[PDB]
Amino acid sequence: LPPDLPDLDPECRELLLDFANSSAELTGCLVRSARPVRLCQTCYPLFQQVVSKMDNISRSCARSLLMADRMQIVVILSEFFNTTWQEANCANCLTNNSEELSNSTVYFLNLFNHTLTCFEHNLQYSEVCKNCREAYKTLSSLYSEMQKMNELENKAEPGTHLCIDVEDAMNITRKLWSRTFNCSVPCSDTVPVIAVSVFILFLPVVFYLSSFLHSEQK
Amino acid sequence: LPPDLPDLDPECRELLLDFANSSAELTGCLVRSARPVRLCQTCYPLFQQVVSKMDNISRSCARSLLMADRMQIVVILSEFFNTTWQEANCANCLTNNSEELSNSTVYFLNLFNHTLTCFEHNLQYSEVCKNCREAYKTLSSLYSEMQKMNELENKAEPGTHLCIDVEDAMNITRKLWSRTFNCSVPCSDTVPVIAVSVFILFLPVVFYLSSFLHSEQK
Amino acid sequence: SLKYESLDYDNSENQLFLEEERRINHTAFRTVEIKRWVICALIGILTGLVACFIDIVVENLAGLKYRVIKGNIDKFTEKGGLSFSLLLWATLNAAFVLVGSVIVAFIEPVAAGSGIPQIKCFLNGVKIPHVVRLKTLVIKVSGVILSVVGGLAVGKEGPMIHSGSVIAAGISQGRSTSLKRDFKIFEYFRRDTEKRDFVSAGAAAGVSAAFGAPVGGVLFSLEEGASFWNQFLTWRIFFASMISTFTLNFVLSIYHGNLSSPGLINFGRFDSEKMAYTIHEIPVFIAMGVVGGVLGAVFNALNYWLTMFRIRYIHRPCLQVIEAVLVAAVTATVAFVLIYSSRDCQPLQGGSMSYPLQLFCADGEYNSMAAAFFNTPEKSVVSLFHDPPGSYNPLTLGLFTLVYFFLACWTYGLTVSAGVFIPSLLIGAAWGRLFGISLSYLTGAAIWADPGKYALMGAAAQLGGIVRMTLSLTVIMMEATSNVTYGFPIMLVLMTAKIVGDVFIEGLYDMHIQLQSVPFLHWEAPVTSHSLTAREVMSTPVTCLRRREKVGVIVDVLSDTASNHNGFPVVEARLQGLILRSQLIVLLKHKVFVERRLRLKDFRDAYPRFPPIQSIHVSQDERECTMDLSEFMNPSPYTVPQEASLPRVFKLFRALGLRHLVVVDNRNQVVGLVTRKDLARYR
Amino acid sequence: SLKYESLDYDNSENQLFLEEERRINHTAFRTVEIKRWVICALIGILTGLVACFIDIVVENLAGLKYRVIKGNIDKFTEKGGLSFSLLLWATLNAAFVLVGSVIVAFIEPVAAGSGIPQIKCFLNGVKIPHVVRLKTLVIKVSGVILSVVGGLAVGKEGPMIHSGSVIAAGISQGRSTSLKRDFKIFEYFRRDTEKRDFVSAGAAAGVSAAFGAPVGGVLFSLEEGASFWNQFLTWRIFFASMISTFTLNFVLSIYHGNLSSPGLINFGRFDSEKMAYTIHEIPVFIAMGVVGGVLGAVFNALNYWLTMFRIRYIHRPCLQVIEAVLVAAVTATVAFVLIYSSRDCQPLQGGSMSYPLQLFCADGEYNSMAAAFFNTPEKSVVSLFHDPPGSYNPLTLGLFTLVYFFLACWTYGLTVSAGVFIPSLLIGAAWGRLFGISLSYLTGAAIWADPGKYALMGAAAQLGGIVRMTLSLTVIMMEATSNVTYGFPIMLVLMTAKIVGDVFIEGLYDMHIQLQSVPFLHWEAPVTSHSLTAREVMSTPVTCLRRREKVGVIVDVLSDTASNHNGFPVVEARLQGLILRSQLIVLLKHKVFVERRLRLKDFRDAYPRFPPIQSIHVSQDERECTMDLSEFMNPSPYTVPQEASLPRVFKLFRALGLRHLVVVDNRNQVVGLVTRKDLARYR
Ligand SMILES: CCCCCCCCC(=O)OC[C@H](COP(=O)(O)O[C@@H]1[C@H](O)[C@H](OP(=O)(O)O)[C@@H](O)[C@H](O)[C@H]1O)OC(=O)CCCCCCCC
Ligand SMILES: CCCCCCCCC(=O)OC[C@H](COP(=O)(O)O[C@@H]1[C@H](O)[C@H](OP(=O)(O)O)[C@@H](O)[C@H](O)[C@H]1O)OC(=O)CCCCCCCC
Ligand SMILES: Nc1ncnc2c1ncn2[C@@H]1O[C@H](COP(=O)(O)OP(=O)(O)OP(=O)(O)O)[C@@H](O)[C@H]1O
Ligand SMILES: Nc1ncnc2c1ncn2[C@@H]1O[C@H](COP(=O)(O)OP(=O)(O)OP(=O)(O)O)[C@@H](O)[C@H]1O
Ligand SMILES: *[C@@H]1O[C@H](CO)[C@@H](O[C@@H]2O[C@H](CO)[C@@H](O)[C@H](O)[C@H]2NC(C)=O)[C@H](O)[C@H]1NC(C)=O
Ligand SMILES: *[C@@H]1O[C@H](CO)[C@@H](O[C@@H]2O[C@H](CO)[C@@H](O)[C@H](O)[C@H]2NC(C)=O)[C@H](O)[C@H]1NC(C)=O
Ligand SMILES: *[C@@H]1O[C@H](CO)[C@@H](O)[C@H](O)[C@H]1NC(C)=O
Ligand SMILES: *[C@@H]1O[C@H](CO)[C@@H](O)[C@H](O)[C@H]1NC(C)=O
Ligand SMILES: [Cl-]
Ligand SMILES: [Cl-]
Ligand SMILES: [Cl-]
Ligand SMILES: [Cl-]
Ligand SMILES: [Cl-]
Ligand SMILES: [Cl-]
Ligand SMILES: [Mg+2]
Ligand SMILES: [Mg+2]
């Protein structure tokens, strides 16, 4: 029979096997590296390898492997990987070279490590708050600065997300601060606000009553 | 620190690892078993195991693994698997018990094997056609019968697809028959069709001319 | 031309009408408005049910016919003898079309055509003899069913309009004249004004059911009426149209099982990035409209040359039946030949075609020509609008466009219920998609060159070119497309397509109205209108009835066989009012002479059919008595100065829906009368 | 009430007009229609550009204000002293509102309000003194900008209507009276009829730009005009509206960079399975409309009690400025207090709010009350329509609904440019979503109980209840929603909401029109209309001008300080025509006496402002000369019989847009005259 219809050509066999191996590794790593979220710094090499292998396929065996079925399992798998990558903004962590993480995200994660070091240090909750205030505030300031830097660099719309690992760390810290330890102590200014609002609300009543009485007097 | 925020609880670790292993196996099998298409009969056990493991998770560790991130890698992976399964109609191959394939699809694939046996037998193309006509016709009749049976059993809309493996085999056979060997020999009835059409097209002209001449005569 | 009477929309404010209104308003409760709203609701509901019935029957019958033909073709593909399939197709088409043409040509010739020109004339104020009869409704429904199932290049959308009108004209009266069964409701609305109002509501409901375009139907009715603005009537028409759409959708949904069927034809959803136009596309659209106009004109032109022939050789009913049968057979033969000679085989997505036909094509493939001819026109149009860029072969599409254009031109004038909206839309969509493919080839596969958008534009352009509507058509297309933006291109292509068309020939509906010698009043008087005045328009001398007239003179004037005038101005020679022939006949039949008292109910009971003059018997002695007319005439007839300009007179006549306009001198002297025929004899 | 004159829509077909038309048609080419189309295109383009300018300026200024306030609040959150933020908010609001109220109250008081009542009166035929002036346009644009940026519960959508009208009234004349600059084009259209036509086109364009609803604007203009159907005028209005929408969308798109902005407010896309209604939901919709009506009535009622107070105590301009400033300050204070007392913190999706405010909320969370008050009303409405089931807290939504209801009731009558559409829509959406949440709780989280659909229904119900429009409002909501199906519920809720409202109180626009003592003609005469006749309506004795009248008598009658009549019927005592005061003044100014020849261009040059009687100087000898009036009057005035029924007279007067109607006897005897004030003094 013709080589292509009944069974696979010898060369395309290797490409399919390699893509299968890479996809399996990437999927396992994603599942294992999602709690706490480590998708970026752990899975970036595997994702790069998967993309490289699919490009290798696309650049003779493209026809016999990609689009000769109602489905295209290769295509849908790669597109799912790409959707997960894009919907993470994980390129934020990586530089233009894709080789290693940017110093910004390393710095943030390392401040996160130092912060949790402070938290555990003083756990054994006034102690923890009093001593880790500065660490938490530096962490939050850096998160805001990176948010603004990403927004201006990508010229993206406001509220655009960052690396999921950074956001997950930010949220873990926020939950530890606001709730488990409840260190937040916003100031209260009830009396000035109440007085000012009451006076301003009184003003229109005085205006209308004065108009009424003055018109009555004529 | 609290067990859940910074790091994973000991129990959820096992669930995440098991799901990762199953997902990796399933993805590798899908990539390897897609050319020629073998997704159903090869991957059904792995898909069943993945579904079972995710149900195991969902039924304490659901909270800490599923929906405590902007993403839910577990959820999106399982939903991608389910989309691939549903968009295959692969339940057609499997019985209600999900254990093994139905006798219908086994019978079809086995007729496909017998058919390709006939094709290779007579390859060494009039020989192949003359001897495998009956095999190909039985295969096509069975495919049509299964199409109708699926349509009436599922009460689905016309043209609904079947197991991707069955369709891929059907198409491989169709390509071998119609093109590589070009065995199809539809009959020609040019003369009767032409004569009938010409006469029927003449009729209106006669009608109008007769009306004209008769009215002129008065 | 003189058998076409007029509609008495101008209600006469006589003493009896004033007394009736006073009594009605003195009942402590008014029910007329509630009854009007109820009637509109019933009109919409029944129109929707009729549309549902038509759709269901067409679906089932056409499905069976196509299944039989496809089975025969597949059975004979390899064994041979494909001619027998052609014979079977032609025979089935001929049988169905034979039944339809027999029921129409012999029993009710009025049911022929779409029925839209008839309703246009009705809302203009002209009564065609058998437009709103029950027999006409039954015949039209059966004929549209048979013609659609008969394989003709026709549509089942336009006729709905007519159908709705009939219903509105029927249930409003509260009785069945044809069946001679009377129910004791809705006696008040037994008059021409309410009848016309309800008919406008019904036509709007029919348009909405056909296209899912309530506002479009409202605008259609408003344009055809072209009257003084009425807020409550417009509200009622809107209500009826929307109830019609809701009823159609709900009933179809419940029939199918599980709110996605606003109308009979549904173009689909155009909300996509592919369907989007730039400013640079404004010129091309216009250019394409030009083509429409041109093509449309040619279409109409040819039909004219056809119609004359039919009027003057093929006028006997049996000849009409033979012509319809032969047209159906030739349509089937042409479709079969085009499918047979096709060589383009395409893979089948699965469910893309209800009945995929494989003929000299590799297994697992279908023939596109079959898709074009072996399918319903509506979903063919829908596919033409929604398909990927490379879903069509230019040669097959061009052949289909040409052949269907000629077939639809041939088929419009046949003595069968049919329509011309969908065929025109299909022709336009086909050549518009051809234009889009050409542009994509020329523009290097540019993103903005989407063939479906250009197909929609071509459909709109062709529809406008053939039937030249701009506003209501634009709104209908906007609602069906469900996108407001695409209106701006549409309005342009419809604007130019119309203009170019008017250079060469008039529209189809207008042309057929004139060929029937119907007096049709347009929106405005001609260019020379300002030059003319009412003195030449009015007819003299005028036959006037004295406020104190004898029975003998009235009988003599009424019985005059020279002419039959249904309105006479009263005179003292000072105008005092106007009385219609019908009122005089009713008065004579009741022997109301001066030498126990009448009510308007007696006038309404004689509606809508009044006895002739010859029927009334008056003795010699009675003829010597006098008739006191003062208390039965219109005391405030509409009048214009003898020197009033023609455009002013035409404007007043059209806006107020008048039948008789008295032209008077400076001393309230009757010097002339004006009717629609005086105004319509200009161009 | 007597300072409100009327619009001369009834063109006088005098000899000079006939000669002008003859010459124009004898030029071998007609350009009037082309010029009309060009004018409509410019009207649409300029209205779109004005809308774009307003949107851009509002966006930038409001963004800066909100950013400053948010930065101050965040800076003082933990350090303390949050009162200073309240002071800053109030001060900014007060400054902007102060500038707006100063420009409106002192320079141009006519610019106050939405301007929709003024245009309604204009299309009805009543001229309010300074409605279509350039100063009014500039003041209205600046005031709407300042009020929207001033933090008031107002909208920038209604005023666009007014703006469009001005443009149509300005560029049509071809000259600038205010700037005293004349360009030599469009002399033909210097008349009331063309002015009203163009103004209707401009109002339709404004509606389309505001809501992206061209057909809705066309219907609005048609309803307000309520005249004889005109096909070409309706085509032109449709053209102008669609050009306006296209211009707005295109300019906004190019400004933003990369066809998704049909109007200023855009409700969004409702094409979803969540947005779908069953038959069982028809009753609840109606019930909800009831509430609307009730609530609407209360709203209007309170405003009435407010307006009277303002008319009779707060009428000095400085008091108006103080009131506006205080209202702005109180609005800011109430918003700040509600935000401060809020305890519901919600996670932020990212970009859900342009300026998310965190105040006594955990890090990474926002305050919903800030979202309600610290955001634009338009996108607040959009969010209310499109949010998940559990996106709101019932208590916060109820508080916001109540407070905003009272604030919007307070703010409508202020001496600042503003609007009442968007606030009513927002109130309706809020309490409709509250109803939807209640239903979902009651129905066990049923799928059909989607709060967004009920929010849309409540918005429609409240809008109808406050401003009681049914047809054009229904079409506007359908186009904005971009779904035709949801019309059927809408039409119902608008139908009942209106009806219930009419039981208690009239609408806002109508109420304000009456409070100005403007003579407003409704669609139909009252219930007792049939009883009355033209004899009581007409005013006697009539001042008539002989066809051969002396200059002295004409001067004496014109100069009579007892009353100022601008129309006199001519008499021989047989009616021969009608001549307006303006024509007599022009004739006297030119010394046209019999004891070189005039053209209509001289009449048009005096437009629109004519000199008074006192200005003309006539010597004693000249007064002894006679004036040949025959060749300058309306030779064919509209006339009705002395006994014609009142509804007939009112119908003719409203449809034809007449100013003077002669009531004549049986011998063409002048016995009375009828003007709009005679008809409007009924209820
Ligand atoms: C799903 C199917 C629903 C379809 C509804 C079909 C019913 C509509 C219809 O097809 O017609 C009804 C007939 C009247 O038609 P009809 O045959 O008597 O025709 C005369 C005659 O033909 C004159 O002929 P003319 O032109 O010579 O004067 C013409 O003018 C004049 O208008 C006509 O009344 O029965 C009824 O009223 C029904 C009873 C109404 C009371 C109940 C109200 C609740 C609905
Ligand atoms: C993006 C901004 C675009 C906005 C366009 C604004 C222009 C529209 C406008 O705001 O107005 C234009 C003014 C006329 O306004 P105007 O101040 O002179 O007002 C008198 C007066 O106020 C009477 O007052 P009255 O009520 O006492 O009689 C009143 O009736 C009468 O209608 C009015 O003409 O200039 C023009 O025409 C422009 C030249 C047109 C020629 C070019 C055509 C191509 C476009
Ligand atoms: N009372 C009348 N006296 C003299 N001429 C008349 C009178 N009524 C009508 N005519 C003229 O006679 C011609 C035919 O009139 P016809 O008898 O068709 O009137 P009609 O049937 O009442 O018109 P319609 O039914 O279209 O309103 C018309 O051209 C008309 O101008
Ligand atoms: N020529 C006339 N002779 C006698 N009464 C008149 C005449 N014209 C108007 N009136 C009456 O005088 C009253 C005031 O009329 P007015 O001077 O406002 O007319 P007008 O200003 O021309 O009306 P409008 O401008 O609203 O058309 C009205 O009630 C009207 O009926
Ligand atoms: C992040 O930024 C710092 C700048 O402070 C980079 O620092 C240099 O790093 C390179 C190695 O890539 C050294 O050779 C240089 O000596 C460092 N200092 C200077 C002044 O260049 C740092 O490399 C950046 N991080 C990454 C990953 O590139
Ligand atoms: C497919 O259908 C055949 C019927 O012809 C089934 O045949 C029986 O199979 C069972 C085993 O499951 C045997 O024990 C029986 O002896 C067989 N014959 C009869 C008459 O029952 C066959 O099992 C079916 N295939 C599957 C996978 O169930
Ligand atoms: C792609 O596959 C071929 C086949 O062995 C191999 O030679 C080549 O190096 C591959 N490319 C990359 C980038 O790995
Ligand atoms: C789910 O996981 C638990 C954890 O070990 C295990 O005991 C249980 O058997 C699992 N369930 C299934 C169906 O494998
Ligand atoms: Cl027809
Ligand atoms: Cl049709
Ligand atoms: Cl039609
Ligand atoms: Cl206002
Ligand atoms: Cl507003
Ligand atoms: Cl408003
Ligand atoms: Mg007649
Ligand atoms: Mg006046």
Numbering used by the authors:
A (entry chain D), B (entry chain B): 73 to 131, 141 to 205, 217 to 310
C (entry chain A), D (entry chain C): 91 to 348, 352 to 665, 673 to 695, 704 to 791
What does the paper say about this structure?
CLC-7 is a member of the CLC family of chloride (Cl-) channels and chloride (Cl-)/proton (H+) transporters and is expressed in the lysosome and the resorption lacuna of osteoclasts. In the membranes of these acidic compartments, CLC-7 uses the large pH gradient to catalyze the uptake of two Cl- ions for each H+ released. Unique among mammalian CLC transporters, CLC-7 requires a β-subunit, osteopetrosis-associated transmembrane protein 1 (OSTM1), for transport activity. In this study, we present structures of the lysosomal Cl-/H+ exchanger CLC-7 alone and in complex with its obligatory β-subunit OSTM1.
Reconstruction of these particle images with two-fold symmetry imposed yielded a structure of CLC-7 in complex with OSTM1 at a resolution of 2.8 Å. The luminal domains of OSTM1 form a dimeric cap-like structure that covers the luminal surface of CLC-7 while the transmembrane helices pack against the periphery of the CLC-7 transmembrane domain. The luminal domain of OSTM1 is composed of two three-helix bundles. Connecting both within and between the helical bundles are five disulfide bonds that constrain the organization of the luminal domain. At the periphery of the luminal domain, non-protein densities were resolved extending from seven exposed asparagine residues (93, 128, 163, 184, 194, 263 and 274) on OSTM1. Because CLC-7 lacks any N-linked glycosylation sites, the glycosylation shell surrounding the rigid, disulfide-linked core of OSTM1 likely protects the luminal domain of CLC-7 from the harsh degradative environment of the lysosomal lumen. Binding of OSTM1 is accompanied by a bend in helix αB of CLC-7 at Gly149 that results in 9 Å shift of the luminal end of helix αB (measured at Cα of Glu168) toward helix αK. The interaction between transmembrane domains is largely mediated by the packing of hydrophobic residues, but polar interactions are formed between Tyr300 of OSTM1 and Glu416 and Trp503 of CLC-7 that may contribute to the specificity of the CLC-7/OSTM1 interaction. In the CLC-7/OSTM1 complex, the 25-residue linker between helices αK and αL forms two interactions with the luminal domain of OSTM1. In CLC-7/OSTM1, the side chain of Phe514 (conformation 1) narrows the constriction of this pathway to a minimum radius of 0.8 Å, which is too narrow to allow water molecules to enter the hydrophobic gap.
